Amino acid sequence: GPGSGTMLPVFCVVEHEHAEFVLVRKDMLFNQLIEMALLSLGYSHSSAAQAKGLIQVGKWNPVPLSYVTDAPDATVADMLQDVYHVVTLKIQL
Amino acid sequence: GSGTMLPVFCVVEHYENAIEYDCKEEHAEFVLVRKDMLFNQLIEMALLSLGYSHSSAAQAKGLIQVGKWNPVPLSYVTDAPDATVADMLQDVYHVVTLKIQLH
Amino acid sequence: PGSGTMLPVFCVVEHYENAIEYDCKEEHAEFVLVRKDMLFNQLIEMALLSLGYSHSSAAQAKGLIQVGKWNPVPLSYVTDAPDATVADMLQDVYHVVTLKIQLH
Amino acid sequence: GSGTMLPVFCVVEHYHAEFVLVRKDMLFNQLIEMALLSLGYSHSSAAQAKGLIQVGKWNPVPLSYVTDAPDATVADMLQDVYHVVTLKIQL
């Protein structure tokens, strides 16, 4: 079933607008998701590190990624395997 | 069309007192709710549909959960008092769990 | 429960509204809850019954199943397992499938 | 706007499936060729190529079962279901 591979698609909207799917490694830490998405788009290490990111399910209010889970070791797969197709990552440089 | 109803997966937790011990019971089931019902009344509608007394809702807490994310209060989902069930749940009903605790 | 005993199935029921004046091809779309452990080959009839249709029309109806916007296909194409349940076949996909039912 | 790409969970069968991004507005009848190129196969490989698409736990069905509309796009057919289907490509 989809997602059983190594990557998950995450829809990203980057403003500073540009909206686009990015493939992210499932086994990487969820708390690094914003940085990883931006690095995939060619943003510098320092630009990726300083961005503001909110995650949105469907039409719900976007929230900080820290609202999603308290576990420092949560992976992208842990949090997104079941919901990647309805989430939007809203990133502000 | 797309119908008048949307499915919502609900888990109702309530304590049942035996004699020498208590049980934290969990009853999980899908409920159909009207798309046009106000979202902030989801807890009341769910309980009614699951067969709970009207009075149980006035002693209930509820959190809504997407996938395996931390559950959050309904008020965290939207600031709009007039948001409907369809507004908030049409695109995500299959990944949400409504977790209700009866006191 | 843990997973519940019911599963939602989205149905679109087509029927001609008996009018002496003219033919109206009505489509009624609605979700219905059915037992997870019901046999998949019972789904059309039981979906109709659970939606409130009479036994007569639930018995003579013809069904197709549609993934997203794909061409609908007969239910026979879903599985060759004679004892497959509704849960077996639809647990993972009920939110993208439409049961297209044509009444007699 | 809504992105130009769509993820498709693809595998070329032999004897692991992975997501590939493909252009949404491209014809559905070009999907196999697009997926093949993204997976490291040549234009030539697409010539004889056939696809089976698997929905959840269902029997896989030939890609041809999906639509009889020559102008259907990848988005038309896959936007709503790319998270529950696997494209299996047969060379």
Swiss-Prot record, chain D:
Name this protein carries in UniProt: DNA-binding protein SATB1
Disease implicated: Den Hoed-de Boer-Voisin syndrome: A disorder characterized by global developmental delay, moderately to severely impaired intellectual development, poor or absent speech, delayed motor skills, and early-onset epilepsy in many patients. Most affected individuals have feeding difficulties, poor overall growth, dysmorphic facial features, and significant dental anomalies resembling amelogenesis imperfecta. More variable features include visual defects, behavioral abnormalities, and non-specific involvement of other organ systems. Developmental delay with dysmorphic facies and dental anomalies: A disorder characterized by mild global developmental delay, impaired intellectual development, walking by 2 to 3 years, and slow language acquisition. The severity of the disorder ranges from moderate cognitive deficits to mild learning difficulties or behavioral abnormalities. Most patients have dysmorphic facial features, abnormal dentition and non-specific visual defects. DEFDA transmission pattern is consistent with autosomal dominant inheritance with incomplete penetrance and variable expressivity.
Entire-sequence positions represented here: 71 to 170 of 763
Biological role stated in the UniProt entry: Crucial silencing factor contributing to the initiation of X inactivation mediated by Xist RNA that occurs during embryogenesis and in lymphoma. Binds to DNA at special AT-rich sequences, the consensus SATB1-binding sequence (CSBS), at nuclear matrix- or scaffold-associated regions. Thought to recognize the sugar-phosphate structure of double-stranded DNA. Transcriptional repressor controlling nuclear and viral gene expression in a phosphorylated and acetylated status-dependent manner, by binding to matrix attachment regions (MARs) of DNA and inducing a local chromatin-loop remodeling.
Subunit organization: Interacts with CUX1 (via DNA-binding domains); the interaction inhibits the attachment of both proteins to DNA. Homodimer. Part of the nuclear protein complex gamma-globin promoter and enhancer binding factor (gamma-PE) composed at least of SATB1 and HOXB2. Interaction with CtBP1 when not acetylated stabilizes attachment to DNA and promotes transcription repression. Interacts with PCAF. Interacts with sumoylated PML and HDAC1 via the CMP domain. Interacts also with DYNLT3 and POLR2J2. Binds to EP300.
Motif (Protein interaction): 60-64
Domain CMP: 3-91
Gene that produces this protein: SATB1
Subcellular location: Nucleus matrix; Nucleus, PML body
Family of the protein in this entry: Belongs to the CUT homeobox family.
Protein modification: Sumoylated. Sumoylation promotes cleavage by caspases.
Residues with PTM N6-acetyllysine: 57
Entry comment describing in which tissues the protein is expressed: Expressed predominantly in thymus.
Entry superkingdom: Eukaryota
